[PDB]
Amino acid sequence: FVMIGSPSVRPFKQRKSLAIRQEEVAGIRAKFPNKIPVVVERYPRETFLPPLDKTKFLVPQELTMTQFLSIIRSRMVLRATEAFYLLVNNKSLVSMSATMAEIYRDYKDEDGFVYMTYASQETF
Numbered sequence: 001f002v003m004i005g006s007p008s009v010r011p012f013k014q015r016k017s018l019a020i021r022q023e024e025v026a027g028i029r030a031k032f033p034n035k036i037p038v039v040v041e042r043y044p045r046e047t048f049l050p051p052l053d054k055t056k057f058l059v060p061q062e063l064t065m066t067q068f069l070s071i072i073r074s075r076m077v078l079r080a081t082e083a084f085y086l087l088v089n090n091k092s093l094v095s096m097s098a099t100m101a102e103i104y105r106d107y108k109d110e111d112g113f114v115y116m117t118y119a120s121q122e123t124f
Contacts, residue, residue, distance in 0.1 A: 003047045012039055012055055018111060024056075025112040032058055036104045037112060040072060041090075043119035049084055050076055056113075062099035069096070072118065090117035091124075 036059040042051040069086050088107050
Protein backbone atom coordinates (compact mmCIF):
# COMPACT_ATOMS: atom_id res chain seq x y z
CA PHE A 1 0.00 0.00 0.00
CA VAL A 2 1.95 3.03 -1.35
CA MET A 3 2.26 5.75 1.18
CA ILE A 4 2.01 9.04 -0.59
CA GLY A 5 4.07 12.21 -0.56
CA SER A 6 2.98 15.77 0.17
CA PRO A 7 3.98 19.34 -0.99
CA SER A 8 7.03 19.79 1.26
CA VAL A 9 7.64 23.43 0.31
CA ARG A 10 11.38 23.94 -0.24
CA PRO A 11 14.16 23.96 2.47
CA PHE A 12 14.86 27.26 4.06
CA LYS A 13 18.52 26.59 4.03
CA GLN A 14 17.77 26.99 0.27
CA ARG A 15 15.12 29.74 0.37
CA LYS A 16 17.76 32.15 1.30
CA SER A 17 21.27 32.45 0.16
CA LEU A 18 22.98 33.08 3.57
CA ALA A 19 22.80 36.81 2.98
CA ILE A 20 19.06 36.96 2.30
CA ARG A 21 18.56 35.56 5.92
CA GLN A 22 21.64 36.71 7.74
CA GLU A 23 19.78 40.01 8.04
CA GLU A 24 16.74 38.35 9.73
CA VAL A 25 18.96 36.51 12.19
CA ALA A 26 20.44 39.82 13.24
CA GLY A 27 17.13 41.64 12.68
CA ILE A 28 14.93 39.70 15.14
CA ARG A 29 17.74 39.13 17.60
CA ALA A 30 17.68 42.89 17.77
CA LYS A 31 13.98 43.55 18.61
CA PHE A 32 13.30 40.66 21.06
CA PRO A 33 17.07 40.00 21.67
CA ASN A 34 17.15 37.71 24.70
CA LYS A 35 15.30 34.99 22.76
CA ILE A 36 16.34 32.13 20.43
CA PRO A 37 15.07 31.80 16.88
CA VAL A 38 14.29 28.30 15.73
CA VAL A 39 13.71 27.09 12.24
CA VAL A 40 11.57 23.98 12.19
CA GLU A 41 11.46 22.20 8.82
CA ARG A 42 9.56 18.94 8.23
CA TYR A 43 11.83 16.20 7.15
CA PRO A 44 12.05 16.56 3.38
CA ARG A 45 11.42 12.85 2.88
CA GLU A 46 8.63 12.46 5.49
CA THR A 47 5.23 11.19 4.37
CA PHE A 48 2.70 10.52 7.20
CA LEU A 49 3.25 13.92 8.74
CA PRO A 50 1.61 17.33 7.89
CA PRO A 51 3.88 20.36 7.63
CA LEU A 52 3.62 23.56 9.64
CA ASP A 53 1.88 26.85 9.16
CA LYS A 54 5.15 28.52 10.15
CA THR A 55 8.87 27.92 10.37
CA LYS A 56 10.58 30.63 12.30
CA PHE A 57 9.68 30.44 15.98
CA LEU A 58 11.14 32.61 18.66
CA VAL A 59 11.93 30.78 21.89
CA PRO A 60 12.81 31.36 25.61
CA GLN A 61 16.39 31.06 26.72
CA GLU A 62 15.42 27.91 28.72
CA LEU A 63 12.76 25.65 27.29
CA THR A 64 12.79 21.85 27.42
CA MET A 65 12.65 20.36 23.97
CA THR A 66 9.81 18.32 25.43
CA GLN A 67 7.75 21.47 25.94
CA PHE A 68 8.94 22.79 22.61
CA LEU A 69 8.03 19.53 21.00
CA SER A 70 4.55 19.82 22.52
CA ILE A 71 4.02 23.38 21.25
CA ILE A 72 4.90 21.97 17.92
CA ARG A 73 2.68 18.87 18.06
CA SER A 74 0.12 21.45 19.20
CA ARG A 75 -0.17 23.15 15.73
CA MET A 76 -0.43 19.82 13.90
CA VAL A 77 -3.78 18.07 13.63
CA LEU A 78 -5.62 15.86 16.19
CA ARG A 79 -2.24 14.24 16.93
CA ALA A 80 -0.92 12.98 20.34
CA THR A 81 -1.68 9.19 20.25
CA GLU A 82 1.03 9.45 17.55
CA ALA A 83 4.59 10.66 18.24
CA PHE A 84 7.25 12.05 16.05
CA TYR A 85 10.86 12.64 16.79
CA LEU A 86 12.29 16.14 16.74
CA LEU A 87 15.88 16.15 15.44
CA VAL A 88 18.38 18.92 15.48
CA ASN A 89 19.77 19.46 12.01
CA ASN A 90 17.88 16.33 11.00
CA LYS A 91 20.95 14.58 12.32
CA SER A 92 21.05 14.94 16.10
CA LEU A 93 18.79 13.22 18.62
CA VAL A 94 19.06 15.16 21.82
CA SER A 95 18.18 15.34 25.50
CA MET A 96 14.43 16.06 25.82
CA SER A 97 15.22 17.81 29.07
CA ALA A 98 17.49 20.50 27.78
CA THR A 99 17.04 24.29 28.03
CA MET A 100 16.83 25.89 24.60
CA ALA A 101 19.75 28.02 25.62
CA GLU A 102 21.63 24.78 25.94
CA ILE A 103 20.83 23.73 22.32
CA TYR A 104 21.70 27.19 21.03
CA ARG A 105 25.16 26.91 22.44
CA ASP A 106 25.77 23.57 20.77
CA TYR A 107 24.12 23.81 17.34
CA LYS A 108 23.49 27.44 16.45
CA ASP A 109 24.08 27.23 12.72
CA GLU A 110 26.36 29.43 10.64
CA ASP A 111 23.59 32.02 10.94
CA GLY A 112 22.01 32.39 14.40
CA PHE A 113 19.23 30.07 13.29
CA VAL A 114 19.18 26.71 15.04
CA TYR A 115 17.52 24.40 12.44
CA MET A 116 15.36 21.38 13.33
CA THR A 117 13.69 18.79 11.34
CA TYR A 118 10.98 16.71 12.56
CA ALA A 119 10.18 13.28 11.15
CA SER A 120 7.95 10.26 11.82
CA GLN A 121 10.92 7.92 11.24
CA GLU A 122 14.36 8.25 9.79
CA THR A 123 17.24 5.89 9.16
CA PHE A 124 20.81 7.29 8.97
